[PDB]
Amino acid sequence: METLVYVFLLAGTLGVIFFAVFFRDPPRIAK
Amino acid sequence: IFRFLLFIQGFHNFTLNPFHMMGVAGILGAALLCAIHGATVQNTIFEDGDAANTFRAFTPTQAEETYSMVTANRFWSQIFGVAFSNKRWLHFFMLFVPLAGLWTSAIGIVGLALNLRAYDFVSQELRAAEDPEFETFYTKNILLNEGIRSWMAAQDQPHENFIFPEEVLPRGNAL
Amino acid sequence: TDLDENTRTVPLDSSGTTVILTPEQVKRGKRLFNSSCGNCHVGGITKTNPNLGLEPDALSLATPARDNIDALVDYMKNPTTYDGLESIAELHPSVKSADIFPKMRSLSDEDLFAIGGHILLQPKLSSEKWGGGKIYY
Amino acid sequence: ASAWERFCSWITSTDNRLYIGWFGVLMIPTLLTATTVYIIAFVAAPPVDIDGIREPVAGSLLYGNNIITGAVIPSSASIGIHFYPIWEAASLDEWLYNGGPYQLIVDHFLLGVCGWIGREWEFSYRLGMRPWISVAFTAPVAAASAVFLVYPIGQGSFSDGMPLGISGTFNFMLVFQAEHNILMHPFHQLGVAGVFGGSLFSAMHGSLVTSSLIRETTENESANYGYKFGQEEETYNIVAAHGYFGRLIFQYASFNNSRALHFFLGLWPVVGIWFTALGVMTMAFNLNGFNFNQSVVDSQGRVINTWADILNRANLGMEVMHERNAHNFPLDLA
Amino acid sequence: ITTEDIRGLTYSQVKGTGLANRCPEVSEQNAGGTIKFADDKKYKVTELCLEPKSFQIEEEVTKRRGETKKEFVDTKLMTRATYSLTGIEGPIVFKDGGLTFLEKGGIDYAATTVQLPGGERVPFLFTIKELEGKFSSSQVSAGTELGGNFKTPSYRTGLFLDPKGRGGTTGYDMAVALPGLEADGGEGQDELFAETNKVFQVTDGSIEMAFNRVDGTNGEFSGVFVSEQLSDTDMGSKAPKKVLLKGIVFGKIEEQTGDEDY
Amino acid sequence: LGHPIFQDKEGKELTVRRMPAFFETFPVILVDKDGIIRADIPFRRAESKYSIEQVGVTVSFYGGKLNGQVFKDAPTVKKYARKAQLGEVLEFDRTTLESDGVFRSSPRGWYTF
Amino acid sequence: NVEYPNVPYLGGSDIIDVNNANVRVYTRLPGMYPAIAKKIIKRAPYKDINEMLEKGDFTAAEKDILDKYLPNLTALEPAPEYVIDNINNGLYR
Amino acid sequence: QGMFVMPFMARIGVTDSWGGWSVTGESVANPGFWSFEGVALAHIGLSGLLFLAAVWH
Amino acid sequence: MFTLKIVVYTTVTFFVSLFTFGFLSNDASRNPNRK
Amino acid sequence: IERRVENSLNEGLNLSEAWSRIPDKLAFYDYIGNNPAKGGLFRAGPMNKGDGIAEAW
Amino acid sequence: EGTGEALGIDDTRLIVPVILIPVITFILYAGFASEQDNEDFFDTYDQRR
Amino acid sequence: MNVSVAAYLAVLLGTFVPVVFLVTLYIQSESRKAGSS
Ligand code: CLA
Ligand code: CLA
Ligand code: CLA
Ligand SMILES: CC(C)=CCC/C(C)=C/CC/C(C)=C/CC/C(C)=C/CC/C(C)=C/CC/C(C)=C/CC/C(C)=C/CC/C(C)=C/CC/C(C)=C/CC1=CC(=O)C(C)=C(C)C1=O
Ligand SMILES: CCCCCCCCCCCCCCCC(=O)OC[C@H](COP(=O)(O)OC[C@@H](O)CO)OC(=O)CCCCCCCCCCCCCCC
Numbered sequence A: 001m002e003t004l005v006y007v008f009l010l011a012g013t014l015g016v017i018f019f020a021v022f023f024r025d026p027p028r029i030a031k
Numbered sequence B: 001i002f003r004f005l006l007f008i009q010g011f012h013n014f015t016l017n018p019f020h021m022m023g024v025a026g027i028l029g030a031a032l033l034c035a036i037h038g039a040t041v042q043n044t045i046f047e048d049g050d051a052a053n054t055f056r057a058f059t060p061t062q063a064e065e066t067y068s069m070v071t072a073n074r075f076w077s078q079i080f081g082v083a084f085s086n087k088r089w090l091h092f093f094m095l096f097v098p099l100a101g102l103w104t105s106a107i108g109i110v111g112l113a114l115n116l117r118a119y120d121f122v123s124q125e126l127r128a129a130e131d132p133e134f135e136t137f138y139t140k141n142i143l144l145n146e147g148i149r150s151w152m153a154a155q156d157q158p159h160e161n162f163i164f165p166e167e168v169l170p171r172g173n174a175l
Numbered sequence C: 001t002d003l004d005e006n007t008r009t010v011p012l013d014s015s016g017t018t019v020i021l022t023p024e025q026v027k028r029g030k031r032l033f034n035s036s037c038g039n040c041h042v043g044g045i046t047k048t049n050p051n052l053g054l055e056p057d058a059l060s061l062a063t064p065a066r067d068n069i070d071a072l073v074d075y076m077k078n079p080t081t082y083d084g085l086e087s088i089a090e091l092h093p094s095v096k097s098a099d100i101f102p103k104m105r106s107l108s109d110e111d112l113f114a115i116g117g118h119i120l121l122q123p124k125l126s127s128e129k130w131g132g133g134k135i136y137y
Numbered sequence D: 001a002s003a004w005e006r007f008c009s010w011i012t013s014t015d016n017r018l019y020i021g022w023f024g025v026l027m028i029p030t031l032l033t034a035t036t037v038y039i040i041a042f043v044a045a046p047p048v049d050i051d052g053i054r055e056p057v058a059g060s061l062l063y064g065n066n067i068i069t070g071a072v073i074p075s076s077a078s079i080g081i082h083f084y085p086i087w088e089a090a091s092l093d094e095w096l097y098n099g100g101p102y103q104l105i106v107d108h109f110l111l112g113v114c115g116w117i118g119r120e121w122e123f124s125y126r127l128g129m130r131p132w133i134s135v136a137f138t139a140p141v142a143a144a145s146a147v148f149l150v151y152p153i154g155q156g157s158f159s160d161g162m163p164l165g166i167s168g169t170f171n172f173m174l175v176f177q178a179e180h181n182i183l184m185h186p187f188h189q190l191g192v193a194g195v196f197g198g199s200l201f202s203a204m205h206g207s208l209v210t211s212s213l214i215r216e217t218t219e220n221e222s223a224n225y226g227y228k229f230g231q232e233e234e235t236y237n238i239v240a241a242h243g244y245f246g247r248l249i250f251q252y253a254s255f256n257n258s259r260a261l262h263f264f265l266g267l268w269p270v271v272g273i274w275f276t277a278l279g280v281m282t283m284a285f286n287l288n289g290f291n292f293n294q295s296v297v298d299s300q301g302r303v304i305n306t307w308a309d310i311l312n313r314a315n316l317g318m319e320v321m322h323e324r325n326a327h328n329f330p331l332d333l334a
Numbered sequence E: 001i002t003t004e005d006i007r008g009l010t011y012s013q014v015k016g017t018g019l020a021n022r023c024p025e026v027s028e029q030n031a032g033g034t035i036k037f038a039d040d041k042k043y044k045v046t047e048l049c050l051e052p053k054s055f056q057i058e059e060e061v062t063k064r065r066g067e068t069k070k071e072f073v074d075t076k077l078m079t080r081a082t083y084s085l086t087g088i089e090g091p092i093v094f095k096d097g098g099l100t101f102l103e104k105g106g107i108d109y110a111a112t113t114v115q116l117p118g119g120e121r122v123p124f125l126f127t128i129k130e131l132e133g134k135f136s137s138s139q140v141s142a143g144t145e146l147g148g149n150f151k152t153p154s155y156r157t158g159l160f161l162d163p164k165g166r167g168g169t170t171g172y173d174m175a176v177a178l179p180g181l182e183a184d185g186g187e188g189q190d191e192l193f194a195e196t197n198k199v200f201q202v203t204d205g206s207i208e209m210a211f212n213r214v215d216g217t218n219g220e221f222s223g224v225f226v227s228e229q230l231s232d233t234d235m236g237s238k239a240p241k242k243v244l245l246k247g248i249v250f251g252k253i254e255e256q257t258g259d260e261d262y
Numbered sequence F: 001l002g003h004p005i006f007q008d009k010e011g012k013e014l015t016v017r018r019m020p021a022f023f024e025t026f027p028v029i030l031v032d033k034d035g036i037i038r039a040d041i042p043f044r045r046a047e048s049k050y051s052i053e054q055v056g057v058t059v060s061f062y063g064g065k066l067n068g069q070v071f072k073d074a075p076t077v078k079k080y081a082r083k084a085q086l087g088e089v090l091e092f093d094r095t096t097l098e099s100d101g102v103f104r105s106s107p108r109g110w111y112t113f
Numbered sequence G: 001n002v003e004y005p006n007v008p009y010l011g012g013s014d015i016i017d018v019n020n021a022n023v024r025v026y027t028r029l030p031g032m033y034p035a036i037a038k039k040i041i042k043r044a045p046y047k048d049i050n051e052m053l054e055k056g057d058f059t060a061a062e063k064d065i066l067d068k069y070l071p072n073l074t075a076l077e078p079a080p081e082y083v084i085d086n087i088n089n090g091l092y093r
Numbered sequence H: 001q002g003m004f005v006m007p008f009m010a011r012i013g014v015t016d017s018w019g020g021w022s023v024t025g026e027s028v029a030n031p032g033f034w035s036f037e038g039v040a041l042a043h044i045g046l047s048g049l050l051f052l053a054a055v056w057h
Numbered sequence I: 001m002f003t004l005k006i007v008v009y010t011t012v013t014f015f016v017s018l019f020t021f022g023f024l025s026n027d028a029s030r031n032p033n034r035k
Numbered sequence J: 001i002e003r004r005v006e007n008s009l010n011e012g013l014n015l016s017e018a019w020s021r022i023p024d025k026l027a028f029y030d031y032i033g034n035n036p037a038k039g040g041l042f043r044a045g046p047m048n049k050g051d052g053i054a055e056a057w
Numbered sequence K: 001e002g003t004g005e006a007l008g009i010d011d012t013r014l015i016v017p018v019i020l021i022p023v024i025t026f027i028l029y030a031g032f033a034s035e036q037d038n039e040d041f042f043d044t045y046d047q048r049r
Numbered sequence L: 001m002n003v004s005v006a007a008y009l010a011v012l013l014g015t016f017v018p019v020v021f022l023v024t025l026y027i028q029s030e031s032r033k034a035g036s037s
């Protein structure tokens, strides 16, 4: 049952990484 | 200091301490930040001269950035997915990582002062006690710690007058 | 303490006579031991056959007893098994087998004397290190 | 105007979110394979007979491990450094018994990080930026090859490579110290200098840049917003930081040149990690750290201990207790 | 593979091909012989090689905690190519009403492991150590069978240490990682006595080799065997499981030279 | 359970050396009055000199609920040597809280931490 | 085996249990290690030391050595855990 | 055993496992890809692909 | 086992050939300073 | 089950033999604990969590 | 393993992909190559694609 | 594995509470940015 928690936490970290890479705030130059 | 490192490992199992883990994370991440920042800045420099050796093409008092933040951002964004876009954030991060590592590891050593040590995982100790075929690298580390303690105590703590015969010293087959 | 003569006096013969090694003798003996037999006999042990070490207990209980200079020196030229019934000159470095053991070719009688002096001097230097092994490193 | 030309343009395109390039062609499949097999073997994999003595060691979460104790166990010592793909096993079950996933993951991952070095070079060429970020990356990769590949080659067994876990990493450390005395080996000391100095210079450089930030922000606003991305002007006063650091120690020590400063920042940790990776590579072939044991003796000639001897006691305890059932002979020559 | 063919191959050809684990056989061309045991001549076995080709384990039919019904099951090998036993040799003597082979040497054991359906691993020591085989005649020929019982030693010896440093001949005599459990004065760690008390227990097995080819020129014979034994017990912690091996056998009978020193 | 006096085979009083706080696991050695090692619980039984079997030891309990009891078998001597390593020997209930046999820290240590 | 009452006779006491003792212990008794101990361990299980002297195939000099060291020798019940490790128990130095 | 969703796999074909067992009780020697584990992994992969398609749309 | 071997050989050869003939397709010209 | 044992009895078998021929699975179905109309709204988990794991008949 | 086959090719089947896939890639690359200006140049690299 | 039982609550809630705090701080801020325009 702890394998459920470990897997969920690792998958959540991977999901945060995915969303940070692909749904980042796009860099743009100010004016 | 090397003897202190191995003593603390053998008697406290300080590698298993999560605060030590956070500290070594801070140290290695700070070295990583130093290396990547140096390489990135030296490799996105603007062409401010006609000499192949580009160190002389910088003036201390210039009010112009000597390297391209935009090009570095593009490089690291399309290589690594994310990249710094703000110099001030970058340089505060370079500060925060090693400092946070040192303070975290300080918490762990303060814990070790009172023998409040993340020595063992009780679940695996009980399972290995009841299951003599259950082996993990954690258990091998515990055996190594026992070896360190028993084979080090006699000469490392001479005031205790530890006389451990060869019978009681924890050993392995052959060596 | 200095390297006094009490440390440097070692048994010479089987009857009980002693001999006081000179500092040159013990220096040469240490160098010769480390160069000619240290590879197997570092620390008074036997790497190839740890059942039989160079500690004084093993040498005294050997047949003939090897806890003296003459007996050790004879072993360096007429090596035998621990019970002294078979010759192991073909498997042990000996001055009579130096062609197949090229380290024993240059040793003279004084060199063998110095090596035996080093062997008998060592146990006086440490209570358990000579022939003790890893446990007393 | 040819299909191959369009394919090459797409591969070498600077418009993809993540650059692929020709090195990425080799990196992405290899790294994805390594990631997939590592995740699958870490969550669920049978115990592995690492030492070749029919004593399996558990490393997977499903077999009673946590994230700290979990690992992909090194290959069996019976295999040695023989190539052990899936097709060289009589069955997949006995492929997993002898730790084949470690070989798969290590090979694919090493190829992938080599591809990462090359891909870092490549993007820079497309960017028009100077090369060498790639050269800095090599130092981390060199260490990874030293621990995962070169140490098995020197010792002659993939069982000797570092386990792909946290507790197994500590085990590999302790056994390496027991067998080689890495702490006294000067290349590891150079690596320790490299990482400690990297942390020191990172903290120092960040502190001085953050300390001399030019006022471009109101009091109810984060100072970081005083910098606008892509601006032409410097975001901090180099003169102020340089003068402060000169007064702190002495004028000559400070790096008045910023490019030299950043070269030094990139140089110190990269050279330190190169040296420690090379040190592990050399101790793979058993050129160990210094052995000052019994180096001080009195006039009689009896050993007066030093800190080297007390360190030797810990090394000896680890040596005797490591792999208790694997050794049948007194010397640990393998 | 015949012995004449093994001599033809060099080590470079045989290495890494799996032919070293394979038991030889007597050729059909060289067969129909009779290895007669002349009186006033002491004979002995040599090169008695046994390759098991099928491994079966007596597994319970259900995971019920009180399951008494068990059926043998097919198994697949985790270990690869270490199963065969080679070089077994022994004196042939008139111990009892007929001839008997006494096992006294050779590789004569293999610490193999198999996995059953469902994923459970059974290690066992396939061995014929201390065998007392009885020939079914006074002469080895096609149809003659040699069979008897043997004593299988423990899979782990006393010097083996468990993951918590406990063994038979050595190791801790307690669960050192639970000092609070040993702190109790009433029972202490008595619950863990079965796992802490490592016991070397020698089990029993039987083998029935049946020789289908025999040659009088070389003294060689070959055939098939079925053997029954018990699996690993982990120094008494586990309950042994019955292992039924079947496979092929090669061997030779020669005259005692006086230098064997049996 | 009282004080476990360790009367050796002749009758000399052995004492189990106490566990220092630093050591998670400490060898069980029974030092003499002057403290030369007399008996111990060996790790390697082969070629054992100071085994309690060879020397011979008996545990006589004085005080407590186990008062006036003289155990003289080697196993029961070893079991109480393991207890005497931890100071005074006590009986424990490990079922009310389902205790797992690993020591904890008092409120003193937790406050300090 | 957390209990083995015949430990003292495994090489640590003045008496040696012949049946399940390693060869190394015979280094303690002069003149018996390489040759006599080999024949002692060859036919290891003995009912008693008398059966050892009758069964061991010793030569006359070997019998003389054994007559010297008779009181240092005994023959208890063979222990399989110790008989298997009678020539090499992993105890080197 | 409270197996809710597995019977729906077993209802229309998927009666085997990669672990070498079957719901019918027989022992599988060479299970195919479309076992319980393979079906589960296929559903997870389809979930990921559908998530990516949702992002694109 | 052989099927997996030939599949892996196919995949490895495919990607290695792509790498090989891609870097051989005038990769040096693919820089922003061309012309 | 009754008709099975009845035709077994008509075949000359006795009660012991006749009932021994009834498979354990069929006898297991003839048990109220297997009834779906015996559980509860908040008695959660496998059916084995209630009466237990059936071992034998 | 450890047999010494050239490129691990123990079965002759393994060669079919190993030789053909480069050949299809070579054929696709040739269409690119034949379109290029293949005369010599005096430069560190070719700027013509 | 004889693991603790409140450790489930500890891990899950110590992950949940900061995570929802961060998500709320992000959503609030965005909402405000949208409302300004
Ligand atoms: C990746 C590997 C790794 C890494 C990166 C670290 C990182 C760390 N370990 Mg280590 N450690 C490791 C593996 C690793 N460890 C292993 C495997 C073990 C087990 C064997 C240990 C055992 C261990 C212990 C036991 C301890 C650490 C500690 C530390 C910290 C040291 C901080 C520091 O810079 O101190 C350097 C010291 C200082 C910064 C103090 C001030 C220094 C002043 C400013 C010096 C001024 C000098 C002056 C100019 C005069 C010079 C004179 C000249 C002649 C020399 C840090 C987090 C320590 C810790 O956690 O502390 C909280 C600690 O006590 N580790
Ligand atoms: C404070 C004390 C201290 C310190 C500062 C260090 C410092 C170091 N030790 Mg340690 N060590 C210590 C104590 C200490 N040690 C003690 C007490 C011992 C004795 C037991 C040892 C024994 C020891 C050994 C035996 C070894 C070290 C090594 C090292 C180095 C590790 C870092 C490295 O090389 O990274 C460099 C970078 C890497 C290794 C990482 C590679 C990164 C790859 C290329 C990419 C990975 C990608 C990833 C998988 C996916 C990304 C995910 C994405 C989503 C972002 C470093 C110099 C190791 C070393 O030098 O290795 C060469 C080593 O082998 N130490
Ligand atoms: C309609 C679809 C459906 C059906 C018929 C079943 C059926 C089953 N599931 Mg379930 N399950 C489902 C969907 C379904 N599941 C889903 C979508 C999930 C993912 C979360 C799960 C996850 C799941 C697990 C993890 C497990 C089961 C198990 C089981 C079995 C026991 C059921 C039980 O104990 O319920 C108990 C139900 C209750 C106590 C509540 C029922 C009454 C109502 C609905 C409560 C509503 C409360 C309401 C929302 C207010 C809450 C307020 C809040 C503030 C607290 C049974 C075969 C067990 C099993 O045997 O697995 C092998 C098991 O361990 N299921
Ligand atoms: C099945 C599975 C998944 C298996 C997993 C099993 C496994 C063992 C799990 C691992 C568990 C794990 C994740 C645990 C980690 C726990 C741990 C110890 C955490 C430490 C946390 C902690 C609080 C530590 C405090 C110290 C701390 C703050 C460290 C942070 C480290 C950190 C992130 C450093 C930065 C690293 C990094 C990669 C930087 C990249 C920066 C980069 C993109 C440069 C960009 C850049 C540079 C320029 O120079 C310029 C100019 C520009 C423009 C520019 O852009
Ligand atoms: C083809 C191969 C592609 C592989 C790509 C993989 C890339 C991996 C992406 C990681 C980034 C994660 C999000 C970081 C957070 C993030 O969104 O940062 C984005 C941030 C952007 O900062 P800006 O400068 O835009 O911010 C200025 C503002 O903050 C104003 O103050 O850039 C960085 O700081 C990233 C540098 C650290 C990058 C390393 C992050 C740590 C990685 C560790 C991940 C944990 C692994 C555990 C798994 C269990």
Ligand code: HEM
Residues within 6 Å of the ligand: C036, C037, C038, C039, C040, C041, C046, C048, C049, C052, C053, C054, C058, C059, C062, C066, C072, C075, C076, C080, C081, C082, C083, C088, C091, C092, C093, C115
């Ligand atoms: C100067 C040269 C050497 C000297 C003086 C020397 C000394 C001795 C002595 C005194 C013994 C007997 C120990 C005892 O009785 O307990 C011995 C035994 C032995 N030595 Fe050496 N030795 C030398 C070189 C070596 C080397 C280099 C090796 C191996 C590489 C070696 C291997 C042996 C062996 C195998 C025995 C035989 C013991 C036996 O079978 O009884 N020795 N040595």
Ligand code: OEX
Residues within 6 Å of the ligand: D051, D077, D155, D159, D160, D179, D322, D323, D326, D332, D333, D334
């Ligand atoms: O396995 Mn890993 O490890 Ca390198 O040493 Mn020899 O073998 Mn074992 O011992 Mn110490």
Ligand SMILES: [Cl-]
Residues within 6 Å of the ligand: B174, D326, D327, D328, D329
């Ligand atoms: Cl070995």
Ligand SMILES: [Fe+2]
Residues within 6 Å of the ligand: B041, D209
């Ligand atoms: Fe900067």
